[model samples]
Target chain A: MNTVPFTSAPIEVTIGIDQYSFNVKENQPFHGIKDIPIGHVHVIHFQHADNSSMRYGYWFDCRMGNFYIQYDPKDGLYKMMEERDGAKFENIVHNFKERQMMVSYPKIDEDDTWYNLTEFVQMDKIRKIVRKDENQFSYVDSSMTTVQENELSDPAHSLNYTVINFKSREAIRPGHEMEDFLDKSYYLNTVMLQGIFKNSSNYFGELQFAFLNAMFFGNYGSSLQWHAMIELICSSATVPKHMLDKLDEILYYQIKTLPEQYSDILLNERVWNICLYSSFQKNSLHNTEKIMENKYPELL
Target chain B: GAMNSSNYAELFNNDIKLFVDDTNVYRVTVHKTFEGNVATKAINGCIFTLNPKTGHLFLKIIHTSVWAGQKRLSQLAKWKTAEEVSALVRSLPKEEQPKQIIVTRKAMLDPLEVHMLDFPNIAIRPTELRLPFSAAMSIDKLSDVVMKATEPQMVLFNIYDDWLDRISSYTAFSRLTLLLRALKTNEESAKMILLSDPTITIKSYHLWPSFTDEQWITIESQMRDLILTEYGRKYNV
Candidate 1:
């Protein structure tokens, strides 16, 4: 029952080793990434046409990966770096020195599921997969990955541990030919997290989001500044002057946009729990000097 | 329930264009109300030419008035300076001479210069001259706005009033203005209006007001010619 008419010439494009044929919409141009070095992709998007420099682009891992029967050429870059001891390890993975991952990746020809720009498994984290036999697994990376920048498959969605649940093995990889994952071990130099959180619904949601975001990041539990925080998220040296007055301006403009379910959670007690302690700690209710003097009596 | 030309006559009665005929002597003072800046405070000279429908013309006496006591020569030093420029009006005949030579802003009857003071028959006074005054940007000038401005040039000009001041402040902008002006004057050249409606953007919200017809037009036209230019070939021209 399709009624909308859309007729345009199909443009064949190759992202990494995968060839895709897309219908050229009137305004959207066919953007191509050509001759980018094998392992890493070169992304160039402009936020402001005014200054193309002082510019930033998406250049994450191109580490190859394997999931069930399919091959994900650009997978495993975001595989978690951890240990059973619970404390996190350096963002990790182990790469093989020879051969392409023998399996094909999932065929993502549909519009909604591919390149949503939201699910960044290789860039962030993509977890979870379940079999009909009731077996499940993740691309758990307590190992080393390769150094050469590999081609990308498709990227978005997931976090902390990209938690996804698929009923079949064909879900993650469905016979699409994947590129060869260059054999090497990648010990990444960067592990950074910086952002604000805001409830998408009401003013209270906004406050609630700010509270969680305040407590989580741009979070104090990770007391190190962004630079020092990364060094400490992996472990660094840290500072002060006006001391706690070191406010993060990014928090100043947290998302206060109203959302779909904002009102529903407004009076929820659990929502209050997520908010109160952090809100109070951040918005005072703290007599610091006395506690600081006692806890770090020598440093003070 | 009555209206006539007599009332209309008083309405169009422009002293700047006053007259009197031999057969019927009409009320003509050759003097009128004038105004409206700081210059070197300036001085205006007056005279009379036998204009029929429009009787008197200028003697062309304009000068730097010596009036800004402490702020002397400050250029924009108040309404206090105009020299006695009446010496050059030698061709002025006795009959057409401004029976009353009046000037506004503060001008000095400079010492030893009996040119004005010595003319016993003429009256000398400071009278305000009001012209049709409305600070407005002519559409033609507006048309030229885009031709001159680049993307960021004068983007913050928030009101119709700041159109000139804001644009004229920067060298690049002003240069662009003149460049467009010259380009516009060369219409026989361009394939089309170099700038378009959306391009010659304007943004402003400033004010300046209050004037009667003669007062407003007197200033408005003068400004368009002096400060701007081309009132006839202008948008609403």
Candidate 2:
């Protein structure tokens, strides 16, 4: 019973060689990737007034090979970047300010490798999915435009993609229509163990992303998990200053560019950790360790 | 009790409308009674007038005398500094306080040219016709502070000239006494001293019309005529 009214008109997302239509009604569960093909969404189109970039529209987590399907507002259409271009698009978006992740990414590369275990089980860490040639159509200026058959072999069509799938769909489902929020990764990722991976290609962006997440949690929720996460990243011997320094740089830019409502959340309301770890190396390490001990005593 | 004309009028007994009767002339009288008595009393007034045609502002001190118990002293009282007048005014109750106090720096009675030219042969000098008081301006010509006198419940005009030793010291150079009307008013009335050292007779009177600066900004439509500026305006006159 979706008592919450749908604000935007429904958007139809065409995915896979089979071209299964996922008519995404606002706030409804358009089930995670099951029988549908992964990594082959051609185009996502919706009617919107503004020409500017989309905040909650279709975006690719270049960090992980996952596309998020949700409500959007856009007059123009969107096309995913090509794979042979060789640029890893890892910009992970979050709504930690909402105290919920609109899209949850696998925290560790180990859990990420599970998606690679697909039909053609290859020893290489990348998953391979072969799609049959079929007649495909995409909207071009309101009329159906025929996409050529050989166009699939181009660099953009070569990469395999997956939609974000929850660990347990039943567990993550909201109680009501308006309650479309998810924080399953908060429990699944085991807040203490999750942090910047050593193998990340974009360490700066990833680290910045991690700090944003922690800052959001710390400022908005002020929970033990944020404290544990901050300790994990900020408690390190050689990295706290650099990490906090980078956080400051990003905060400066965000305030200048973003709106006050969006920009103000970058200010961590709970600044005790940054304040303590800012100076005096010995005190920073000692205090961070003490905080970790209190938060996760078993690790001690 | 509130910000009203009658209530403000109730605070002081003598309300001298500055620059009203005489376009450029105003007077402030300073009176003090030691322990609120008829004896041990002193009264003084300083006259201020701006020459509308000549554009020169003048000051001349009126005679001051002190009374002790039953007898009155005849000789003029010693010239008191601005600091002394402020202290004396603060010692009195609000009801007994004058409308304003004229506090000034020391001025020398420069001998007139008649003493040198007219009676060259005479051993004794003739009576000096004019008092040449230097309008000694400071290197920093601009400084101003408007504050309330709590004891007497009146506004004190402590502007640049009164605060510095410029008036007392004999200086080769001169400057201006900048004015802004904040001592109470719905109107803005100002005069500029383009050149300093107008050899005029006077006492350093506290600013005229002892109304609060709060009152000054509230009254005038000309208040809206002036534009907000980061720096002071230049007066051609």
Candidate 3:
């Protein structure tokens, strides 16, 4: 993190006559964050290293009812947009939700029968960029070249700000040589997805496990593997009953609609793990059945 | 309550109370001589406490090593990892810091417990002498002890990885938080914690650094136990 302290000084971003500036990271996502008042125009000059600069300039002209962005002070927003194919903003409207799919790759194809217990266990392993090797690193799919910063408004203001990077902070370090830039982007949406689960309820993995681990008939049919590992390690007994059941009220549906906002592949990664957590909960009998049948034969 | 499980909390605290009734020794929640993100340390351990009458919880950690890798970092490296360690330790409710400290056998003499030698009034105990590593029985012996004892009682066991030939503390942390968002997610959150593992780490700014997903899921679930604090605040409960 030898970050050359990008903001040794704060750059003021003026909007709607309100001049504001604070020092922070290029992390947080814009989803539930409060917005500035209407007719707000904000701009900044973020100088990271000498010639290497990453700046954020945004404005919400409610008069035009659209957002404006500029690359740097030397040029105007539309002028830079001119240089980078500002052609079809209309066609790119579809790229909105996909904006948040940054840090990791977006989900891909998902077919339920395609997954097996062994694969289930493998999926839970730490996700890797190199699989396993010294040079292996993670990156946002370089294929994802579009950027969408949604317009957001609150009681006070209307402002739209978003960033999707094609590079990781590490690969861009001053001394380190960036590899495979042609093939991959480091991370795009850095609102910090890890922090998301902390604020929500039933978002808890234990409770989620309880809801998904239903009896044979309702549990998406526990005819799967690793349910063995699930049963032995966790159970409803370990969790409070009312709390568990009360939570499933929401989880029962949330897991189903995941595909709406996530890719089938992304959906698959999570659904498969959710199944493991399910087996962890209510399905011990099936859990024993699968493990005993050597569903995970290599382990037994 | 902050780090391990609830049941572990009950047993860990009950036993500590049995051993030292005046003050429960829960140094395993956060401290050295023991600590997770556990690195080259030979071994790691932790324990916690909960008062039955007042229902308050306390934490203490024992993540440390005997040789080879323990205390083997640059004087600066050890200090920084411990600095990360201290942040988590201090994050605990001010009321929960270790009152009774435990020292025993190899861990008794380990620099981990020795590091705590400066904790003002911490009561240090040599476990072997504290009446045997238990004629009393197994006392939460876990590599990564993750538990939710009962309501609001958890004993999460986390320790920082060893940083022998690594970068400066500030640099290492920024690197971890920046590149290892997954690790940062788990460590800062309420579960036993680990989202992704570092595949290869090279020296950066001068610290180099880099886990398991099953145990990670186990750790991640601790958010349920931890959310009680938030809910308690929101509901004003």
Ten residues in sequence with the least summed lDDT for candidate 2 chain A: A138-147
Residues A71-187 of candidate 2 have per-residue lDDT tens digits of 434633333322322222122221221333222222243432212211112212122212222212211222111122233244333222111222222223322111111123332
Please list the residue runs of candidate 3 whose C-alpha ends up more than 4 Å from where it truly belongs after superposition.
Answer: A1-110, A113-282, A285-295, A298-300, B1-100, B103-237
The per-model DockQ list reads 0.00, 0.00, 0.01
What residue runs in model 1 are displaced by over 4 Å at the alpha carbon?
Answer: A1-300, B1-71, B74-85, B106-115, B132-237
lDDT (Cα, tens digit) per residue for candidate 3, span A46-134: 22333222232221122332222232444421111211233343233224224532122112347221111111111111112112222
- For each candidate, the alpha-carbon lDDT, in order, equals 0.24, 0.27, 0.27
Residues B86-196, candidate 2: write the lDDT tens digits: 233346475533342211211201111111122222121111212112221111121121011112122223333342332321111111222232111111232212112
lDDT of 1 at A186: 13
For residues A35-62, what per-residue lDDT tens digits would candidate 1 score against the true structure?
2223321122111133222211122232
Residue B180 in candidate 2 has what lDDT? 34
